Amino acid sequence: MEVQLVESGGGLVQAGDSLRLSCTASGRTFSRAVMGWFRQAPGKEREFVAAISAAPGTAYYAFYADSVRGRFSISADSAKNTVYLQMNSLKPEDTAVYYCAADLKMQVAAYMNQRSVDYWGQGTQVTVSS
Amino acid sequence: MEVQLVESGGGLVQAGDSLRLSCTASGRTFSRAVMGWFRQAPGKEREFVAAISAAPGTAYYAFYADSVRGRFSISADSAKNTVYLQMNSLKPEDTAVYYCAADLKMQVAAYMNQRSVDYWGQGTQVTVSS
């Protein structure tokens, strides 16, 4: 079985600035899963950031953790089987290894525990200096 | 929550060589979960490698994937809350990112589904040169 999630983006950023992450998934996984983002701060467990789920037609449902509401935008593109996280107004507190996630059981975007995740992309370092 | 699993070790070795990896777990996870290793080969989804019974003190079961049987061995140091993956007679085909994992819903060493894993350590690159 081929790797299901392939992620892109990351790097060093100044406080206040923006950075975009993205992740592709296989056709089968993209269509069968709620896609999400998690982050692992230094010395901490990975915690939920945001999720997005397909709805009938062109529609999507999005859900954000309290830490990131307003400042981040999640989106998806069916034609490219890709999910995106645009992060804005970044703070030193946002420094972490960021992971994309696929959850086959969940149907509608909601808070996601890491134990419910079926597939992970490879983690990527995002560093925000003051 | 503090990070549960911290991996150590990795690098480039030659075919026929050996290498031991390690991973520390919180006291709580060491006593409660089956611990194991997975590996993610280039362009492939991560696969089960080895597992060890919960609370591996003076005695434990160990279990292995067919592709690593006899060459690979898993053990533990209870006093250091640490599990080890010993890899003998390495082949170019063992080249992969190696992950340690814990599943709190398992007690006896056995095949681990990646979907059922509660906690992950950060991947470590092992490259075996032809």
CATH number assigned to the domain comprising residue A48 = 2.60.40.10
Which chain A residues are Cβ-neighbours of B43 within 8 angstroms? 2-3
CA distances from B124 to A24, B7, B23, B35 (A): 22, 8, 11, 17
DSSP bridge partners of B82: B24, B77
Given an 8 Å threshold on Cβ–Cβ distance, is A45 in contact with B2?
Answer: yes
Given an 8 Å threshold on Cβ–Cβ distance, is A97 in contact with B1?
Answer: no
Determine the straight-line distance between the first and last CA of chain B, rounded to whole angstroms: 42
Contact A9, A124 (CB under 8 A): yes
Structure tokens at A10: 């990351």
DSSP string for residues in A34-80 = EEEEEEE-TTB--EEEEEEEE-STT-EEEEE-TTTTTTEEEEEEGGG
Structure tokens at A21: 């992450």
Looking up tokens 């992969």 gives B96
CB-CB neighbours of A74 under 10 Å: 22
In 3D, which of A21, A25, A26 has the Cα closest to residue A8? A21
Report which residue type is found at B95.
T
Report the alpha-carbon distance of residue B36 to residue A27 in Å, rounded.
Answer: 30
In 3D, which of B89, B77, B75 has the Cα closest to residue B19? B89
Structure tokens at B89: 């007679």
Residue B9: which region, alpha, beta or left (left: phi > 0; alpha: psi -120 to 50)? left
Which chain A residues are Cβ-neighbours of B116 within 8 angstroms? 115
Nearest-by-CA chain A residue for B114: A118
Structure tokens at A113: 């525990």
Tell me which DSSP letter residue B2 carries.
B
CA-based diameter of chain B, in Å? 42
CA distances from B102 to A40, A67, B39, B122 (A): 17, 27, 14, 13
Report which residue type is found at A106.
M
- Quote the number of domains for chain B: 1
On the CB side of B64, how many CA atoms lie within 13 Å of its CA? Answer: 13
Q: Experimentally, how was this structure solved? A: X-ray
CA distances from A39 to A114, A123, A125 (A): 10, 9, 10
Report the alpha-carbon distance of residue B118 to residue A23 in Å, rounded.
Answer: 22
CA distances from A93 to A11, A12, A44, A123, A128 (A): 15, 13, 12, 18, 8
Which chain A residues are Cβ-neighbours of B44 within 8 angstroms? 1-3
Contact A74, A64 (CB under 8 A): yes
Report the alpha-carbon distance of residue B15 to residue A79 in Å, rounded.
Answer: 42
Contact A92, A129 (CB under 8 A): yes
Task: Indicate which of B6, B39, B46 best probes the interface with A, i.e. most A CBs within 10 Å of its own CB.
Answer: B46
Q: What is the resolution of this structure in A?
A: 2.1
Chain A, 13 to 42: residues with Cβ < 8 Å from chain B are 40
In 3D, which of A73, A48, A70 has the Cα closest to residue A60? A73
Q: Which helix (H) or strand (E) holds A27?
A: helix A27-32
Nearest to B43 among A2, A97, A117 (CB): A2
Domain that holds residue A87: 1-130
What angle is formed at CA B13 by the lines to CA B10 and CA B14, rounded to 5 degrees? Answer: 165
Residue A54 burial by Cβ neighbours in a 10 Å radius (0-12, 13-18, 19+): buried
